[model samples]
Target: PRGSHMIFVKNLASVLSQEWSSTEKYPGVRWKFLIDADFDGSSGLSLGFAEIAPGGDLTLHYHSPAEIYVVTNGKGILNKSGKLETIKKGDVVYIAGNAEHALKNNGKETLEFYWIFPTDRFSEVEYFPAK
Candidate 1:
């Protein structure tokens, strides 16, 4: 079913009832699903929160759909297309479709960010790792 109304998940705990992890692929990374076709009623977009534990990293990967990442707090280096950029609180990064990207948390605290994709379900997207 397509989403027609607003859906809200209060608190991080409620928002992250089920955990999505990429430890094998990207160590110390966790995703909290918020809005998606399977999770909620999202039809055209998917929203979620991601956290990287201190000294953790998200390895280079790409998907069919583009992504928008908003850094809520903490610090890290965002690697996109081989270019590394420092990212911090309140920083927003736009990732183009099929662009290789990665992130590493170098700060003492965990790196938290909100991510959005222009798709109904995240499962429909496939991740491809850079060789």
Candidate 2:
């Protein structure tokens, strides 16, 4: 990441969508995103960083292999198999195999996290927006 250039550096106050409507469910909202990873599908690996706005929630979904995440800051609730658990910074969640779950930033501040995936296909573990 040393050679990576700064492609985006806008302040939160300068951007719109401070509170985005959920694209999948009836829960909370999402405002920020970092889907700007630069890599070809041939690499078979990918990484991303996302900042979920306070009260934002990611609908239930899953992956084929495993999804790894490191909580950077703030607090939130993670749901898996109908169980919800509180998560915070330094918390590492290794989701092995397929499972339906969601990430909800129920706190008053943004929830930031980093994700590491095992593929670059970019759509394998993706879920269609639920109606």
Candidate 3:
């Protein structure tokens, strides 16, 4: 579910140096320097960082309820419900429940971004295989 393409994650005390709440808000991706997990509604939203290696592919899954994503660095493509969109730094994406979404790193460098969800009672997120 994760990997290390960014050197900062393996060394920094904090996943992101910026405050989790201070991240910019959008429909999909809403984050700044810090990525933390603390949802505002259901479970605590996850505001944390992710590093995708070049050509790396993330699992195609959907949040149990809903979640948001924000790309902080590099470039990638997001497949949501048969719709594909290119993402780059400061790109925000909103994914609804049951949407089949995956991240693909298409650039020469690794892709770094932040993911957040709003829910707590749930222990884990459920992901469905992509079609």
Best by lDDT: 1
Model 1: lDDT of residue 44: 90
Candidate 2 is scored at a TM of 0.66
Task: List candidate 1 segments past 4 Å from native.
Answer: 1-3, 6-10
Runs of candidate 3 with Cα error greater than 4 angstroms are 1-12, 15-43
Residue 121 alpha-carbon offset, candidate 1, angstroms: 1.2
lDDT of 2 by residue, 3-116 (tens): 333344444464354453245463444334223234322345555556677878887776566777789889989986579999998899887757666788989888878776
Better of 1 and 2 by lDDT: 1
Question: What is the C-alpha lDDT profile of model 3 across 1-131, one tens digit per residue?
Answer: 33333212322355444443321212133224232322222224445566776867775666567878777889998887667789999899888877778887877987877677665433466655665
Rank order (by lDDT, best first): 1, 2, 3
The 0-to-1 C-alpha lDDT of every candidate, in the order given, reads 0.85, 0.65, 0.61
Point out the higher-scoring one by TM-score: 1 or 2: 1
Candidate 2: the clashing residue pairs are 29-56, 60-101
After superposition of all CA atoms, the RMSD between model 1 and the true structure is 2.1
Off by over 4 Å in 2: 1-42, 128-131
- TM-score-wise, the better of 1 and 3 is 1
Location of the lowest summed lDDT over 10 successive residues in candidate 3: 22-31
